[PDB]
Structure formats: C-alpha cells, structure tokens
Design a protein around this ligand. Structure first.
Ligand SMILES: CC(=O)N[C@@H]1[C@@H](O)[C@H](O[C@@H]2O[C@H](CO)[C@@H](O[C@@H]3O[C@H](CO[C@H]4O[C@H](CO)[C@@H](O)[C@H](O)[C@@H]4O[C@@H]4O[C@H](CO)[C@@H](O)[C@H](O)[C@H]4NC(C)=O)[C@@H](O)[C@H](O)[C@@H]3O)[C@H](O)[C@H]2NC(C)=O)[C@@H](CO[C@@H]2O[C@@H](C)[C@@H](O)[C@@H](O)[C@@H]2O)O[C@H]1N=[N+]=[N-]
Ligand SMILES: CCCCCC(=O)CC(=O)O
Lengths: 42, 40, 40
C-alpha cells in the first residue's frame, strides 16, 4: 500500500485547535489536518 | 503508559493517519480520522 | 500560530496521542482521541 505517505513535519495550533501534518507527496502542499484539544499542563 | 511514536504516515484515500509505536514487537499503531487537502 | 512539536507520544490505556509543543514555558500540549491496536 503506497497510499500512506510520510509526514514531513507536524505542527499544532492553540488558536484553531488543529494539528497540521505536512505530507511527503506531490508538490509539497498537501496536508493532513485534524481537530485537537490544546492546554497547559501541570 | 504513553509510548514514543517512531513513524507517522497519513493516507489521502482512507483519510487516516497511522502512528507506529515504540512498544512490544514494534507492530502496534495509533490511528485516527483526518482531513487531507491541498493548500493554496 | 501553528507551532512545532518537540515530542509525540500515544497511549493505549487512555486512547490518546499527545504532542508536546515548542511554545511559551514549554508545558503546552495538543491531545486527541485515537484508536490503538496491534497489527498482524
Ligand atoms: C497481560 C497484559 O498486560 N496485556 C496488555 C494489555 O492489557 C494492553 O491493552 C490495554 O489494556 C487495558 C486494560 O489493562 C485496556 O483498558 C481497558 O479498555 C476497555 C475498552 O476500552 C474501549 O472502550 C471504552 C468504553 O467503551 C472506551 O472508553 C475506550 O476508549 C476504548 O474504546 C476505544 O476508544 C477509541 C478512542 O475513542 C476508539 O478509537 C476505539 O475504536 C474504541 N474501541 C472500542 C472497541 O470501542 C475499557 O472498558 C476498560 O475500562 C479499560 O480502560 C486497553 O483498552 C488496552 N489497550 C489496547 C490498545 O488494547 C496492551 C496495550 O498496552 C497499552 O497500549 C500500548 C500501546 C502502550 O501505550 C501501553 O503502555 C498501554 O498499556 O498491552 C498488553 N501487553 N502487551 N504487549
Ligand atoms: C517484543 C518482540 C516480540 C516479537 C514477536 C515474535 O513473533 C517473536 C520473535 O520473533 O522474537
């Protein structure tokens, strides 16, 4: 299965509550993006 | 309980990300639904 | 606003992944629900 492609770089955003995974595919501008919780620990 | 992710992949046909875990035989994964799209 | 990840872990007891973020005092995380399982 060649469909799953590596993630080049993972970032997350506490304003939008999303993480964005840049993908090793095509022109470089495809991303995976999902909803996340974000909070300060301790 | 939390274990390191050794590798992360995402799939634009199934719309999932799969994280390979550093645990046991090396064949455990975490997997979640994701959006996938082209930016710009 | 998107910041880098310094460590990525997942947990098969709590069914979450956690990404420690490079921001502020260093204690901020992103955390989301995931499936976890052994393949094979
Ligand atoms: C002999 C031995 O030590 N064996 C080890 C195993 O015990 C261990 O497996 C984990 O074991 C614990 C019990 O000790 C399990 O915890 C229980 O889980 C049940 C079921 O949980 C599901 O359903 C409940 C209620 O409906 C939900 O709240 C849960 O989230 C979960 O449901 C899942 O939720 C996700 C996220 O939303 C969904 O994607 C998913 O589809 C959904 N699944 C289903 C079927 O609905 C719960 O009722 C009990 O109260 C209790 O919490 C735990 O489930 C089980 N984990 C797994 C992944 O099977 C394994 C794995 O070890 C763990 O994961 C590793 C990656 C690592 O992080 C390790 O540190 C963790 O402890 O290891 C065995 N030994 N080995 N190898
Ligand atoms: C922690 C590794 C367990 C590996 C699972 C096996 O199938 C046994 C081996 O070949 O060693």
């Amino acid at each position: 299965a060649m469909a799953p492609v590596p993630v080049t770089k993972l970032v997350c955003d506490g304003d939008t509550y999303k993480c964005t995974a840049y993908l090793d595919f095509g022109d470089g501008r495809w991303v995976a993006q999902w909803d996340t919780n974000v909070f300060h620990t301790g």
